[PDB]
Amino acid sequence: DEFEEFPAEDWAGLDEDEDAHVWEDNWDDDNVEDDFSNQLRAELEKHGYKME
Amino acid sequence: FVGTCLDMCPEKERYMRETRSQLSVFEVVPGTDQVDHAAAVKEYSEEPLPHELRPLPVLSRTMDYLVTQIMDQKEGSLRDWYDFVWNRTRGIRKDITQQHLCDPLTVSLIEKCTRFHIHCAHFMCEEPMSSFDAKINNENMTKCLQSLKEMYQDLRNKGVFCASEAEFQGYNVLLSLNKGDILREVQQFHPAVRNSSEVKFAVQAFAALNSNNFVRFFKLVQSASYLNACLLHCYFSQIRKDALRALNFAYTVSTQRSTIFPLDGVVRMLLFRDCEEATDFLTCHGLTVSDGCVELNRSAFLEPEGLSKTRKSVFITRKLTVSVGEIVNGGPLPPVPR
Amino acid sequence: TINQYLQQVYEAIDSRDGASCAELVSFKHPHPEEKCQQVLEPPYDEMFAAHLRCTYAVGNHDFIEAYKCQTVIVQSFLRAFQAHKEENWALPVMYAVALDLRVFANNADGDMLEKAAELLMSCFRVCASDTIEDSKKWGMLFLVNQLFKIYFKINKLHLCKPLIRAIDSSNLKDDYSTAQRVTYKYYVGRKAMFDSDFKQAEEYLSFAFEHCHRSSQKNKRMILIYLLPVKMLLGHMPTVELLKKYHLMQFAEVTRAVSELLLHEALAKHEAFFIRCGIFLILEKLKIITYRNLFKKVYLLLKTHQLSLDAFLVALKFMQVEDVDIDEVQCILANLIYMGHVKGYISHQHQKLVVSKQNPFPPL
């Protein structure tokens, strides 16, 4: 796992490429209806502590 | 060059000790003057000729006589006991350091000396400045653990294992928690060493430090052995400050109210001896512990400085049912060496 | 065939050429002291005689003699390069003497790697001294990229601090060769992921990820392997498309487990992968942000301002994490309060956490 050196010493600004939208913040939202959250919907509502 | 020394004692240096009057009061004949020819074991002050250096079986018999009788007696003052045994164990370490002969029995001579250093890292903490000097003790301990770390690599590449290999690697991890480089070290252990019982205990202690999980630290220190518990006495002034800072921050409304925090829970999470140590510990920091419960206020809390002297934490010396001699040996003792 | 080599090293000195290094001295082409000492001056020709004797040593595969060769090569070229009086034209020759004593310096099996480290530090302490055109410090960034690469494999990087601060304070910091500019703050981002400096690693190695050549398709992957948990601890997690395109699918379910124990199962299903690259203990520190996301899943499921601690106790009790009780759940929440992830205060008299209502807890 050694960082091998580059074939070219110099390159222009258009030589590199990216995927534009990678590191996004859309996950901090209010989606409750995911399946894993349904599974906890058993366990928090099996101990008699239930709320909407 | 190997030696042919066949004596417990120096053969010449006891006479120079007797003339120049630099004796140790623990090992003399009763009635001063004469040196004890039975026990006047080597002082540390190229190494020439086959005196002043001993081969491995004589030196092993020296370590056996050191562990069976010398560390058990409480005769004399407590000033020179640590100096006597520390100087002689450092003399043994200097002896086999430049002798350049290695064996699994030689590793046990490192093991008993570093167990003595772990035991004296807590027991002699109440000694006043000139007698103990804990800085040079913590300095001396890390050379032993570094030499043991580099020593275990050599026999592993040779192709022989040891039963006591995975034990002190846990103590190597418990030595350096404030240095974050050591995680790279725990990516470089052997898989059988890494998947053992006590290295994963050390991972739990390192996770208890950096996540500041003080509940799974003092509850973790009660589930360990004696030496593992008394090595963690250096971090008690760090954990109990990094834990109470969050607990004097997370209970207030802005900066100006008081959260009445009751007693017998602070001694339950933070491992104190009793109420008497806890009130003295929280009075000096700047908050109020008087009357019924512990006060909490943001503005009336400041960082400490100056004298930060420690005590013996009581709970870690409760797990010392066997005596002082058999801890650094491990299990039983060989009886009557002569 | 020797006379052509003597002619091209004579024209190397006479015409002050920089391509003559790639012509003779470099180990990229097809490759007796008394003859050169007859024809040339001693600091300029001991290079060539040593080079003949250690190409002979490599030609029958002896590495210790070639190691002593390249020690003599770097020392004699250091003495002849101080015997230059401020010119730039030996700086191409500076390139092929340090890189070739990295792969021959690694292969002598450690202490030989520390020996190569100190004798190459002796090269840097003479190279970084003297001096806007005639400056002998243009290859210095080439030199400092090697001193990370020796120091990382030996695992004795206890103090690298004055070696970094000397070149961090520099007038020419934004102008070098851009191939060596990528290879520097990659290692600075390594030293910044370690000992808890995660923002510096993110900026200095996101600069590397935004750049670099697309021809070598191993550098971009090796950046990602060591890039991803920096931005998982910072918060801004990858998408599915980059992991699909670059075939890096081990972290992806982990990026599910951070999003909503599933984390321990996902870590232990590929337990032998993060040990090899040295990621595994860094990845355990995401317990705080996964507990904060579990706090989000509790807060959106029950919808009030004051929540009782027994529900979070049950939610930790499903996880099969050992020795979790009522005092442990009360501790992590105060750590979330102090570091600033979760606003509010832990009431002890009612055992209920009152949270703020305008913003519940800040985003990242």
Short mmCIF file of N, CA and C in Angstrom, two decimals, chain B residues 154-207:
data_model
loop_
_atom_site.label_atom_id
_atom_site.label_comp_id
_atom_site.label_asym_id
_atom_site.label_seq_id
_atom_site.Cartn_x
_atom_site.Cartn_y
_atom_site.Cartn_z
N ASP B 154 12.19 -10.16 18.49
CA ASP B 154 13.35 -10.95 18.06
C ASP B 154 13.08 -12.45 18.16
N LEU B 155 12.46 -12.90 19.25
CA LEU B 155 12.16 -14.32 19.39
C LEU B 155 10.98 -14.73 18.53
N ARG B 156 10.10 -13.78 18.19
CA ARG B 156 8.99 -14.07 17.30
C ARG B 156 9.48 -14.31 15.87
N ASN B 157 10.46 -13.51 15.43
CA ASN B 157 11.06 -13.72 14.11
C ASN B 157 11.93 -14.97 14.09
N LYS B 158 12.49 -15.34 15.25
CA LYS B 158 13.22 -16.59 15.37
C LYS B 158 12.30 -17.80 15.23
N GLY B 159 11.11 -17.75 15.82
CA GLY B 159 10.16 -18.84 15.68
C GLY B 159 9.75 -19.50 16.97
N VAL B 160 9.97 -18.86 18.11
CA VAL B 160 9.57 -19.39 19.41
C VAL B 160 8.60 -18.38 20.04
N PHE B 161 7.57 -18.89 20.70
CA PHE B 161 6.56 -18.04 21.32
C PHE B 161 6.79 -18.01 22.83
N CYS B 162 5.96 -17.24 23.54
CA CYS B 162 6.04 -17.17 24.99
C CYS B 162 4.63 -17.08 25.55
N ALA B 163 4.44 -17.64 26.75
CA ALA B 163 3.14 -17.58 27.39
C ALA B 163 2.87 -16.20 27.97
N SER B 164 3.93 -15.46 28.31
CA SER B 164 3.81 -14.13 28.90
C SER B 164 4.04 -13.02 27.89
N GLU B 165 3.74 -13.27 26.61
CA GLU B 165 3.95 -12.24 25.59
C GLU B 165 2.79 -11.26 25.56
N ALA B 166 1.56 -11.77 25.55
CA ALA B 166 0.38 -10.93 25.39
C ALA B 166 -0.02 -10.20 26.66
N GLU B 167 0.61 -10.51 27.80
CA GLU B 167 0.23 -9.86 29.05
C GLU B 167 0.75 -8.42 29.10
N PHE B 168 2.06 -8.23 28.95
CA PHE B 168 2.64 -6.90 29.12
C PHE B 168 2.49 -6.01 27.90
N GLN B 169 2.00 -6.53 26.77
CA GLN B 169 1.63 -5.64 25.67
C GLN B 169 0.39 -4.84 26.03
N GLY B 170 -0.49 -5.42 26.86
CA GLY B 170 -1.59 -4.66 27.43
C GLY B 170 -1.11 -3.52 28.33
N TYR B 171 -0.11 -3.79 29.17
CA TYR B 171 0.52 -2.75 29.99
C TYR B 171 1.25 -1.71 29.16
N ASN B 172 1.78 -2.11 28.00
CA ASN B 172 2.40 -1.17 27.06
C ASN B 172 1.33 -0.22 26.51
N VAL B 173 0.14 -0.75 26.21
CA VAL B 173 -0.95 0.11 25.75
C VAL B 173 -1.47 1.00 26.89
N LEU B 174 -1.61 0.43 28.10
CA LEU B 174 -2.06 1.22 29.25
C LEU B 174 -1.03 2.26 29.72
N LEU B 175 0.23 2.14 29.32
CA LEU B 175 1.21 3.16 29.66
C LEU B 175 0.94 4.48 28.93
N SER B 176 0.69 4.41 27.63
CA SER B 176 0.55 5.59 26.79
C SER B 176 -0.87 5.66 26.24
N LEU B 177 -1.74 6.36 26.96
CA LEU B 177 -3.07 6.70 26.47
C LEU B 177 -3.18 8.11 25.91
N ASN B 178 -2.40 9.06 26.43
CA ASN B 178 -2.47 10.43 25.93
C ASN B 178 -1.77 10.59 24.58
N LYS B 179 -0.92 9.64 24.20
CA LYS B 179 -0.27 9.65 22.89
C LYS B 179 -1.14 8.85 21.93
N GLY B 180 -1.61 9.51 20.87
CA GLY B 180 -2.54 8.88 19.94
C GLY B 180 -1.88 8.08 18.84
N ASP B 181 -0.56 7.96 18.84
CA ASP B 181 0.12 7.22 17.78
C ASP B 181 -0.02 5.71 17.97
N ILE B 182 -0.32 5.28 19.20
CA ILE B 182 -0.25 3.88 19.63
C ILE B 182 -1.33 3.03 18.97
N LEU B 183 -2.37 3.69 18.43
CA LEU B 183 -3.40 2.99 17.66
C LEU B 183 -2.82 2.38 16.39
N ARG B 184 -1.84 3.05 15.78
CA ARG B 184 -1.10 2.45 14.66
C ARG B 184 -0.37 1.19 15.12
N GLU B 185 0.16 1.23 16.35
CA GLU B 185 0.77 0.08 16.97
C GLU B 185 -0.22 -1.06 17.18
N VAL B 186 -1.50 -0.75 17.47
CA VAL B 186 -2.40 -1.88 17.70
C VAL B 186 -2.97 -2.35 16.36
N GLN B 187 -2.64 -1.66 15.26
CA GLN B 187 -2.89 -2.25 13.95
C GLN B 187 -1.72 -3.12 13.51
N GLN B 188 -0.60 -3.06 14.23
CA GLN B 188 0.57 -3.83 13.83
C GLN B 188 0.90 -4.99 14.76
N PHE B 189 -0.02 -5.39 15.63
CA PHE B 189 0.22 -6.55 16.48
C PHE B 189 -0.04 -7.84 15.70
N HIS B 190 0.41 -8.95 16.26
CA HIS B 190 0.09 -10.27 15.73
C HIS B 190 -1.40 -10.54 15.97
N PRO B 191 -2.10 -11.25 15.05
CA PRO B 191 -3.54 -11.51 15.23
C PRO B 191 -3.93 -12.31 16.47
N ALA B 192 -3.08 -13.25 16.88
CA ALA B 192 -3.33 -13.99 18.12
C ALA B 192 -3.13 -13.11 19.34
N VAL B 193 -2.18 -12.17 19.25
CA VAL B 193 -1.98 -11.20 20.33
C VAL B 193 -3.12 -10.19 20.36
N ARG B 194 -3.56 -9.73 19.18
CA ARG B 194 -4.61 -8.72 19.10
C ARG B 194 -5.97 -9.27 19.50
N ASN B 195 -6.24 -10.54 19.19
CA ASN B 195 -7.50 -11.17 19.54
C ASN B 195 -7.46 -11.89 20.89
N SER B 196 -6.60 -11.45 21.80
CA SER B 196 -6.48 -12.07 23.11
C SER B 196 -7.46 -11.43 24.09
N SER B 197 -7.28 -11.75 25.38
CA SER B 197 -8.26 -11.34 26.38
C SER B 197 -7.99 -9.94 26.91
N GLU B 198 -6.72 -9.57 27.06
CA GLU B 198 -6.36 -8.34 27.76
C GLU B 198 -5.98 -7.18 26.85
N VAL B 199 -5.63 -7.45 25.58
CA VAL B 199 -5.41 -6.36 24.64
C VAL B 199 -6.74 -5.71 24.26
N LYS B 200 -7.79 -6.53 24.12
CA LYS B 200 -9.14 -5.99 23.93
C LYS B 200 -9.67 -5.29 25.17
N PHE B 201 -9.15 -5.63 26.35
CA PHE B 201 -9.42 -4.85 27.55
C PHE B 201 -8.75 -3.49 27.46
N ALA B 202 -7.56 -3.44 26.85
CA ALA B 202 -6.83 -2.18 26.70
C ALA B 202 -7.50 -1.27 25.67
N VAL B 203 -8.10 -1.87 24.63
CA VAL B 203 -8.91 -1.13 23.66
C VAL B 203 -10.11 -0.49 24.34
N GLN B 204 -10.71 -1.19 25.32
CA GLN B 204 -11.83 -0.63 26.08
C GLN B 204 -11.39 0.54 26.95
N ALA B 205 -10.17 0.48 27.51
CA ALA B 205 -9.66 1.59 28.31
C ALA B 205 -9.33 2.80 27.43
N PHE B 206 -8.79 2.56 26.24
CA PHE B 206 -8.49 3.66 25.32
C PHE B 206 -9.77 4.28 24.77
N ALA B 207 -10.82 3.47 24.60
CA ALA B 207 -12.12 4.02 24.22
C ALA B 207 -12.77 4.75 25.39
#
